[PDB]
Structure formats: C-alpha cells, structure tokens
Design a protein around this ligand. Sequence first.
Ligand SMILES: O=c1ccn([C@@H]2O[C@H](COP(=O)(O)OP(=O)(O)O[C@H]3O[C@H](CO)[C@H](O)[C@H](O)[C@H]3F)[C@@H](O)[C@H]2O)c(=O)[nH]1
Ligand SMILES: [Mn+2]
Length: 280
Amino acid sequence: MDIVFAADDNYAAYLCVAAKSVEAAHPDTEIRFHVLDAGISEANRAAVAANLRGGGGNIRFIDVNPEDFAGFPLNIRHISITTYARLKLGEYIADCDKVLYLDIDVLVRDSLTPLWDTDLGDNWLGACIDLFVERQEGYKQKIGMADGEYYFNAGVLLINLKKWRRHDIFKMSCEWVEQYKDVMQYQDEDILNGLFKGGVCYANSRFNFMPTNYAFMANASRHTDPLYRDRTNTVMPVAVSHYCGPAKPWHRDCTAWGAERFTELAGSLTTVPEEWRGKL
Ligand SMILES: O=c1ccn([C@@H]2O[C@H](COP(=O)(O)OP(=O)(O)O[C@H]3O[C@H](CO)[C@H](O)[C@H](O)[C@H]3F)[C@@H](O)[C@H]2O)c(=O)[nH]1
Ligand SMILES: [Mn+2]
C-alpha cells in the first residue's frame, strides 16, 4: 500500500517512529511511503530512510511550501502550518489513485489492509468519526453540516486521489476558509469536513483510536442511528492509536493508552542521530 505522512524538520524523528510501526504491522505488505516535506533537513531525511526497510528504499520525500498556507488559521499551539499540506494531496502525488494519509502522532498496531481495501466508490475519502467534536452539541453545524452528517477526524484518511486530481481542492479550501474563517476551530480538519460532507465513507473507530474513543470504552453515543453506533464502536483489536491533542507518546508523563509501543519502537531503531536522543 501507499502511505502518506506530512511533516517538517521538528517532527522528523517522530515521522520515523510512526513509519516503522506501519512496517511492523505489515511484515509481508509492500509499504510505499510518500512524505510531504515542509523543511526536513537532508540529514533528517537520511536518518529517517535509514531506519526503514530497504535502507529507505520505499520512501520518497515530496517538497511542499509551507508559505502556501500562511493565510490559514493556526490557533492550536502544538500544530504547525504543515498540518494544511494534506489539502494539496491531489497536486503532490501522481503515481497513485489511492493513498492512506496518517498523522505523525499515530501508532499503527494492526494490519491496515481491511481499511485500505475499502471501496470508496465515488466518494472523496474514507475516515473515522471524531467523538470529541461530534459530541460538542452545536459545533458541527457552525460549519454547515447536518445532524446526520458525521464529523470525522483528519488523522487517518483513505483518500480517493483520482477524484481529488479532478478538482481544485486548494482553491475550494481557500474559498471555504474565507466563508467560515470566523468560526472554525479545528483548522484543516474543518476544511475537509465542510468540503466533503455528505460524500464520506466511514470506517470503524479501530482505524483511528483516540483518547475520546478510549474514554468511551468505559461507557453514551451521540446518536441512535445504527450506522453511527456501528462505526463508533471499536471492533477490537485497535489497529491505529491516534494520540490526538496536546499529549503525545513522546512527551513526558504520557498517560495515553498504548503509549509504550512508541518507546518499544524508538529503542528498536537502526540509526539514531545525536540530535534525536532528546526527542526520544
Ligand atoms: O511541530 C509540528 C506540529 C505539527 N506537524 C503536523 O501536523 C499534524 C497535525 O497535528 P497533530 O497530529 O499534532 O494534531 P492533532 O491530532 O493533535 O489534532 C486535531 O486537529 C488537527 C488540526 O489542527 C488535525 O485535524 C488532527 O488530525 C486532529 F486530531 C501532524 O501529524 C503533522 O503532520 C508537524 O509536522 N510538526
Ligand atoms: Mn494527530
């Protein structure tokens, strides 16, 4: 499968860890990494590729310009401008009709092929519902969504590239961001939801297990709709842990579930540059 990650120099070492976890979950699957590079040094991309299979044979860094999104709101502190690069997927990747976008702060624990094998038909993408946002009575509607349309998290995405390449997603994002600039609160996550509402395929929450999903394991469903309940019901085992929010598995005092696998994988790296010692 073709996996897509987006990062800048600051997250280079983390990109490496998330990347390796994907490989560990797919021992016999050919993982092709496409990285949206917003300023990763040559030393940093060299160390990354060095820690993966084939001495970094299945990874290509695609240069992107962070200044491109300079006008987009950046209210959430722990997130950098690089978060909006995914909006130009259709422009940065040609050799794929389908890719699976992953946030750097994810930890892939199980095969992703069941999610990958999803047939998105003519929809824009496949994604997991976001409970934290979905249960914030009245928000989803500020961006034009209906109670029946479900707000998804942009940390894990099966994108129908061929369809994306047909449209000018960056211009529609600009247009939308001008329409809902004084209300959106989740940035690129808002853009994607507004733009593709009503045309999204939903996947079980096992492919995007977040803190809110976890907390719910200790159950009360924002809806009665059988589809929603079916989707927001994680079918064990968790395939993707998404450390959504300010607390990351690489931080100090991380209490988030399964956060140990980060270290387990960090301590298994082939090459660790002196400058990475800290971060890990
Ligand atoms: O120093 C940084 C900070 C952010 N990033 C990029 O930004 C993504 C964005 O942020 P987090 O993973 O840190 O975001 P977070 O998951 O905490 O929060 C929520 O809001 C985000 C947007 O503001 C996304 O929609 C995200 O999927 C959603 F869960 C990272 O994966 C990465 O691609 C970097 O490369 N370096
Ligand atoms: Mn994230």
